[PDB]
Amino acid sequence: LGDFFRKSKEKIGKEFKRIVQRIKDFLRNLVPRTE
Amino acid sequence: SMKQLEDKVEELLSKNYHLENEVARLKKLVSKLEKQLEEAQKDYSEIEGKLEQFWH
Amino acid sequence: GPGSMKQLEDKVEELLSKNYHLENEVARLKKLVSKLEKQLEEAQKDYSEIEGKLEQFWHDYDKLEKENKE
């Protein structure tokens, strides 16, 4: 498939960052009064 | 000349013989590279599958 | 004479036409080989860049878990 590796590199970057950000949102929600 | 045309027949027969064997080598290399690109594809999709397996 | 010379001239023309097509096929297959080699090189280069980024994240998270264990 043409541009499979380009599309998949984009998909891998978007999905991993989505996992990192949702862990970040979850942890931030555990500490409502952090500074 | 007759000798000139006989020599070019033998010359072309020899060149075409090696060109046919070169085409055979190049098509086998293309086939080898297509399989290597197919394996690289599975390695990419394997990372996608691992990232999907986080949500469930 | 002209008869035997015609058989040779025909054979040269036939072998020349096949020679030309074979040379076009060799030049076409070499371009495709170099195209596939560059695609494989770029796919392997981007894969290692993806790999290193994921390794660095795991490494940083590993030290985080160890420091937050005690």
Numbering used by the authors:
A (entry chain E): 2 to 36
B (entry chain A): 38 to 93
C (entry chain B): 35 to 104
Could you share sentences copied from the article?
Success was had with a version of M87 protein (amino acids, aa 68–105) that had a portion of the canonical coiled-coil protein GCN4 (aa 250–278) fused in register to its N-terminus. The structure of the GCN4-M87/LL-37 complex was determined through molecular replacement to 2.1 Å resolution limit. The structure revealed a single LL-37 molecule bound to a dimer of GCN4-M87. Two nearly identical 1:2 complexes occupied the asymmetric unit of the crystal (RMSD 0.70 Å). GCN4-M87 was likewise in α-helical conformation throughout, but strikingly, only the GCN4 portion formed a coiled coil while the M87 α-helices were unfurled and asymmetrically disposed. The two M87 α-helices and the LL-37 α-helix together formed a parallel, three-helix bundle. One of the M87 α-helices made more contact with LL-37 (1016 Å2 total buried surface area, average of the two complexes in the asymmetric unit of the crystal) (dark blue) while the other made less but still substantial contact (491 Å2 average total buried surface area) (cyan); to differentiate between the two M87 α-helices, the one making greater contact will be denoted M87α1 and the other M87α2. Most notably, a number of hydrophobic M87 amino acids that occupied the core a or d positions and contacted each other in the free form, as is typical of coiled coils, were exposed in the bound form and instead contacted the hydrophobic face of the amphipathic LL-37 α-helix. Near the N-terminus of LL-37, a consecutive pair of phenylalanines, Phe5 and Phe6, was surrounded by hydrophobic a and d position amino acids of M87–Leu74 (a, usual position in heptad), Ala77 (d), and Tyr81 (a) from M87α along with Ala77 from M87α2. Lastly, one more helical turn further in LL-37 were Ile20, which was surrounded by M87α1 Phe91 (d) and Trp92; Val21, which packed against M87α2 Phe91; and Arg23 whose aliphatic side-chain atoms packed against M87α1 Trp92. These hydrophobic contacts were supplemented by a sparingly few polar ones, which occurred all within a small polar break in the hydrophobic face of LL-37, near its N-terminus: LL-37 Ser9 and Lys12 formed a hydrogen bond and salt bridge, respectively, with M87α1 Glu85, and in one of the two complexes, LL-37 Lys12 also formed a salt bridge with M87α1 Glu89.
M proteins are the major surface-localized virulence factor of the widespread and potentially deadly bacterial pathogen Streptococcus pyogenes (Group A Streptococcus or Strep A). One of the primary functions of M proteins is to enable Strep A to evade human innate and adaptive immune responses. Despite this variation, the primary sequences of M proteins generally have a propensity to form dimeric, α-helical coiled coils, as verified by direct experimental evidence. LL-37 is a member of the cathelicidin antimicrobial peptide family and constitutes a major host immune defense against Strep A, as well as other pathogens.
